[PDB]
């Protein structure tokens, strides 16, 4: 059967919050079967646990943010994408600060962290959410939708009105795999625009943002001196952001996702609509690896 996976070992990392600007200590730990991904705030007495699930999402305004009354864990999306990307079902994440470290602004460093620690198979069946019929959410000009598909396919369409794009709209479509995710989606960086610089920092946002952890874009061009890791990097990161946000569903998706000028707010808006719509999904497990559609890196 296709089994659940967890970390073989403990790993530690250290970095800075993009929005907060604080130093943060991050620890990753193996966890028991059916635990899912739990986020732990170790700088509080007692320790506070916010599970990584769609129903705990609070603020979605410029990042995906989990809420347990007083306490928050912020900017979870990139880390949760690496974890979905390598098929990590169960892990404890400990943070010493309110926000997850931005690192290089991509899922690459977390992928490096998970591969070095290693994957551990567990003696329990891996469960998936299968999309049985279409679900959609619209917020004026923006849109997002789950459709039935035999595997995992993420598609994105972005219609910026910035000179950097030459009047055109950006599109990329990915057929998800563990191999395709790491070379194809995982190195795609976070981006800011010069023209949000007043607005951004008035509300205490991107306090830790720099050319070292994001694409900084001036009106004329991309200021980062070696340019872009991918020609289509902006849109591959919007795909990195979704994959991460959808994994708060608690389980791998057999289905297709399509985004049209969508973001964290709508992505979370879509999950909740799907959970409510019980007729549009079911949970499934696989007796045989050959019968299962979606392919993961082997430990
Ligand atoms: C944080 C979120 O994951 C995300 N992905 C792409 C853009 N964003 C929003 C980041 C906002 C941001 C604003 C300014 C700067 Cl310098 C850097 C980042
Ligand atoms: Cl807090
Ligand atoms: Zn992002």
Swiss-Prot record:
EC top class, as a word: hydrolase
Keywords per UniProt: Hydrolase, Lipid A biosynthesis, Lipid biosynthesis, Lipid metabolism, Metal-binding, Zinc
UniProt EC number: 3.5.1.108
Catalytic activity: a UDP-3-O-[(3R)-3-hydroxyacyl]-N-acetyl-alpha-D-glucosamine + H2O = a UDP-3-O-[(3R)-3-hydroxyacyl]-alpha-D-glucosamine + acetate
Pathway annotation from the record: Glycolipid biosynthesis; lipid IV(A) biosynthesis; lipid IV(A) from (3R)-3-hydroxytetradecanoyl-[acyl-carrier-protein] and UDP-N-acetyl-alpha-D-glucosamine: step 2/6
GO biological process: lipid A biosynthetic process
Annotated active site: 264
GO cellular component, one term: membrane
Cofactor: Zn(2+)
Keyword Lipid biosynthesis: yes
GO MF annotation: an example: metal ion binding
One Pfam family cited in the UniProt record for this chain: LpxC
Residues bound to Zn(2+): 78, 237, 241
Known function: Catalyzes the hydrolysis of UDP-3-O-myristoyl-N-acetylglucosamine to form UDP-3-O-myristoylglucosamine and acetate, the committed step in lipid A biosynthesis.
Annotated family: Belongs to the LpxC family.
PANTHER family cross-referenced by the UniProt entry: UDP-3-O-ACYL-N-ACETYLGLUCOSAMINE DEACETYLASE 1, MITOCHONDRIAL-RELATED
Protein known as: UDP-3-O-acyl-N-acetylglucosamine deacetylase
């Amino acid at each position: 059967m296709i089994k659940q996976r967890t970390l073989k070992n403990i790993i530690r990392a250290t970095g800075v919050g993009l929005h907060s600007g604080e130093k943060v200590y991050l620890t990753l730990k193996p966890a028991p079967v059916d635990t899912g991904i739990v986020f732990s705030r170790t700088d509080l007495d007692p320790v506070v646990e916010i599970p990584a699930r769609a129903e705990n999402v609070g603020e979605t305004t410029m990042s995906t943010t989990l809420v347990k009354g007083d306490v928050k864990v912020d900017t979870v999306e990139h880390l949760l994408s690496a974890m979905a990307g390598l098929g990590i079902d169960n892990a404890y994440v400990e943070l010493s600060a309110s926000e997850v470290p931005i690192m290089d602004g991509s899922a690459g460093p977390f992928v490096f962290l998970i591969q070095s620690a290693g994957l551990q198979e567990q003696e329990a069946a891996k469960k998936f959410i299968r999309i049985k019929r279409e679900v959609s959410v619209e917020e004026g000009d923006k849109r997002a939708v789950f459709v039935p598909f035999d595997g995992f396919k993420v598609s994105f369409e972005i219609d910026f009105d910035h000179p950097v794009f030459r009047g055109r709209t950006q599109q990329a479509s990915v057929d998800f795999s563990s191999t395709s995710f790491v070379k194809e989606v995982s190195r795609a960086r976070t981006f800011g625009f010069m023209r949000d610089i007043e607005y951004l920092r008035s509300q205490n946002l991107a306090l830790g943002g720099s050319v070292e952890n994001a694409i900084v874009v001036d009106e004329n061009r991309v200021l980062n001196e070696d340019g872009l890791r991918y020609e289509d990097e902006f849109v591959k990161h919007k795909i990195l952001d979704a994959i991460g946000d959808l994994y708060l569903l608690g389980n791998s998706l057999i289905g297709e996702f399509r985004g049209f000028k969508s973001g964290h707010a709508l992505n979370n808006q879509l999950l909740r609509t799907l959970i409510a719509d019980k007729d549009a999904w079911e949970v499934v497990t696989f007796e045989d690896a050959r019968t299962a559609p979606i392919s993961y890196m082997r430990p």
